[PDB]
């Protein structure tokens, strides 16, 4: 199955009484697994499989470089307001991570935003910047002038990212490796007159990752189809949905089981 | 990481070819770096690796083979003024440097 | 760049000693290190960044102070002959995530005597 790793890191400037400065957050999937923000000061586990198998000088040498990341987006971000001529609260994110794909194949990414927008993506394979303006192109030059820095950053998403991916799947693999398969059931109405809407409803499953659509005498649909979002249960599945108006079926797929379920 | 090997020390002659390797066993790596320092004095850096390749400064080349967890240190038309200790330091996973115990080259006249 | 003070102490033991090192790189990251004979450089302390420090591997005798960006001293509350080293301060511009090198100080020679 496609697995991901990822690390975020946010920076607010001027923030309001309870929002902190610089937050950064790790994921596994979906799976929430570090935690760090400007109040607390600390790295902590936010998955229990994490906690019970990282040692407490993962968590204390981590600390020590969160605060000093928290300190360089302080800085980066008060730049960056400057490039713009810009005062108030303003946003800088980061995103590193890496994805291990079921075929065995690897994707990297490293990004930033500015106000939530795309900013500067590193391509890992001409080792160089995309810039979405002049004020990142800046950026971009000097980042591209350091060629020991692209390198490390390449090595990292293409080695260490998927290292420490493979190790915290091992970590969690009885929560991320586990499959419940959907709960899925066609409901039949008649809405505004002669409008029938058919509605196939898939919960309780897990991974979230579904395929879902509608067939009509076995060929695809032409007409229009509504999609629900994928959405968390609350106790670690998900729901979904697909409608359509009226020989149907809905088709699901879910980790390699196919489903049909004929109208 | 757990550990690196330098040998303690090389000899070579004025004028010649030395190659000093590092190996490395460590939990991760994010680069292996070079230091020259010449006795009483302080490390200065030199080269710096983390893909597979050899770059060279002057008549200084360093190499790295991610997969044989190695580099080298190739100093070419050696030089009275080489004499001088070399240090490798690998960054493990958690950005921490391990250091080796360097080498003492000495150049035969 | 790194500018690092005494060159040379004489130390009696339980005597107590600051050691001095200032950069004006507008570096982020300092460190502490010893140096023996025979063995890699070993890491006392270490800033990340202003405002935070930590023990490195071998912290047990020493304390450290970040003052400010720029200064990062070294102190020995109550020095043991076994403290008998050559000091170095070093700096980097960021914190030990990247592929930035370390610029070293001129290094302290410090003897404790009973």
């Known amino acids: 199955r496609t697995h991901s790793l990822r690390y975020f890191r946010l920076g607010v400037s001027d923030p309001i009484h309870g929002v902190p400065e610089f937050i950064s957050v790790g994921y596994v999937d979906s799976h929430p697994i570090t935690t760090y923000d400007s109040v607390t000061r600390q790295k902590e586990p936010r998955a229990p499989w994490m906690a019970e198998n990282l040692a407490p000088d993962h968590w204390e040498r981590y600390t020590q470089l969160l605060r000093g990341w928290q300190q360089m987006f302080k800085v980066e971000l008060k730049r960056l307001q400057r490039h713009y001529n810009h005062s108030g609260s303003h946003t800088y994110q980061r995103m590193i991570g890496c994805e291990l794909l079921e075929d065995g194949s690897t994707t990297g990414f490293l990004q930033y935003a500015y106000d939530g927008q795309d900013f500067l993506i590193f391509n890992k394979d001409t080792l160089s910047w995309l810039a979405v303006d002049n004020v990142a192109h800046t950026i971009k030059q000097a980042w591209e002038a350091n060629q020991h820095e692209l390198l490390y950053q390449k090595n990292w998403l293409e080695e260490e990212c998927i290292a420490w991916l493979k190790r915290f799947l091992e970590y969690g693999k009885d929560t991320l490796q586990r499959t419940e398969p959907p709960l899925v059931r066609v409901n039949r109405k008649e809405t505004f007159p002669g409008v029938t809407a058919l509605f196939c409803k898939a919960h309780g499953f897990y991974p979230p990752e579904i395929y879902m659509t509608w067939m009509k005498n076995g060929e695809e649909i032409v007409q229009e189809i509504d999609y629900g979002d994928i959405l968390p249960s609350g106790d670690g599945t998900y729901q979904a949905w697909a409608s359509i108006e009226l020989l149907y079926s809905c088709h699901v797929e879910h980790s390699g089981v196919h489903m049909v379920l004929q109208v | 990481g757990q550990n690196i090997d330098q040998p303690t020390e090389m000899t070579a002659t004025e004028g010649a070819i030395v190659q000093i390797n590092c190996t490395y066993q460590?939990?991760?790596?994010?680069?292996l770096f070079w230091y020259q320092q010449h006795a009483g004095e302080a490390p200065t850096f030199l080269s710096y690796?983390?893909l597979d390749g050899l770059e060279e400064k002057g008549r200084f080349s360093s190499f790295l083979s991610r997969s044989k967890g190695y580099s080298y240190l190739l100093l070419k038309e050696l030089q009275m003024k080489d004499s001088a200790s070399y240090l490798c330091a690998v960054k493990d996973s958690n950005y921490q440097l391990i250091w080796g115990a360097g080498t003492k080259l000495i150049i035969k006249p | 760049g790194v500018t690092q003070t005494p060159k040379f102490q004489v130390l009696k033991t339980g005597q107590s000693m600051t050691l001095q090192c200032a950069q004006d790189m507008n570096h982020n990251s300092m460190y502490w290190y010893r140096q023996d004979p025979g063995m890699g450089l070993r890491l006392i302390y270490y800033s990340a960044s202003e405002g935070t420090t930590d023990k490195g591997e071998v912290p047990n005798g020493y304390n450290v102070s970040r003052l400010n960006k720029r200064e990062f001293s070294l102190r020995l509350e109550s020095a043991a002959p076994s403290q008998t080293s050559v000091y170095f301060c070093?700096?980097?511009?960021?914190?030990?995530?990247?592929?930035?090198?370390?610029?070293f100080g001129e290094g302290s020679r410090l003897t404790v005597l009973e």
């Open positions: 070093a700096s980097s511009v960021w914190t030990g995530e990247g592929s930035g090198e370390l610029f």
């Open positions: 460590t939990s991760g790596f994010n680069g």
């Open positions: 690796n983390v």
